[PDB]
C-alpha cells in the first residue's frame, strides 16, 4: 500500500473495456471470442494488490 | 475472388493506424503492426434452396 | 435519364468533388471502425436486402 501511494501509475481496465467495445459478435453464432475476454479478465473488480 | 486455386485465397486483411517501435516508413512497419478484420455470417441454406 | 439546362447563369458553389487520396483514407478508417463488429455490418447489410 506504500507503493500504492507513492506510484503515479494508477491502473484502469477502462482501456481494455474501450479496445474491446468495438469488438462484437453476430446474432446467430453462440461462441464469442470478446465475451469470454471481458469476463476472464473482469475489467469491472478493482482489486489490484 | 477466386475459384479452386488455394495459392490464391485471401487469408487476412489487417489495417494498421501506428508506427511500431522507430521505423517511419509505413512500407516497412505495416507487416507486424495491422489488425485483423473480418466477421462470419450464419444463412438458411434451405431458404436459400 | 437527368436534365441540365443551357444557358447563362448566376454563379453557384456546389463543393461535392473530393480526391481519391481523400476518399481511400476515410474509407480505410470507416473499415477500421466497423472491422470486428458485425452488430452494425446487420442493419446495412439488411438495408441492403
Known amino acids: ?4 501511494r507513492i506510484s503515479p501509475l494508477q491502473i484502469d481496465p477502462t482501456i481494455i ?7 462484437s459478435e453476430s446474432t446467430t453464432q453462440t461462441l464469442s471470442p470478446a465475451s469470454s475476454i471481458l ?3 473482469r475489467p469491472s473488480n478493482s482489486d489490484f494488490s | 475472388y477466386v475459384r479452386l486455386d488455394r495459392d490464391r485465397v485471401p487469408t ?4 494498421t493506424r501506428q508506427s511500431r517501435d522507430t521505423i517511419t516508413q509505413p512500407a516497412l512497419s505495416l507487416s507486424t503492426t495491422n489488425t485483423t478484420v473480418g466477421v ?3 444463412l438458411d441454406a434451405r431458404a436459400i434452396t | 435519364t437527368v436534365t441540365s439546362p443551357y444557358a447563362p447563369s448566376v454563379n453557384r458553389l456546389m463543393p461535392y468533388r ?10 480505410i478508417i470507416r473499415v477500421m471502425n466497423i472491422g ?3 452488430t452494425v455490418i446487420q ?3 439488411q438495408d441492403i436486402s
Open chain 1, 1 to 4: 500500500v506504500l507503493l500504492q
Open chain 3, 18 to 27: 473530393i480526391s481519391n487520396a481523400e476518399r481511400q483514407i476515410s474509407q
Open chain 1, 39 to 41: 469476463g476472464k479478465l
Open chain 2, 40 to 42: 462470419p455470417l450464419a
Open chain 3, 43 to 45: 442493419p446495412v447489410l
Open chain 2, 12 to 15: 487476412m486483411v489487417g489495417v
Open chain 3, 36 to 38: 470486428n463488429n458485425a
Open chain 1, 17 to 23: 473495456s474501450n479496445t474491446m467495445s468495438t469488438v
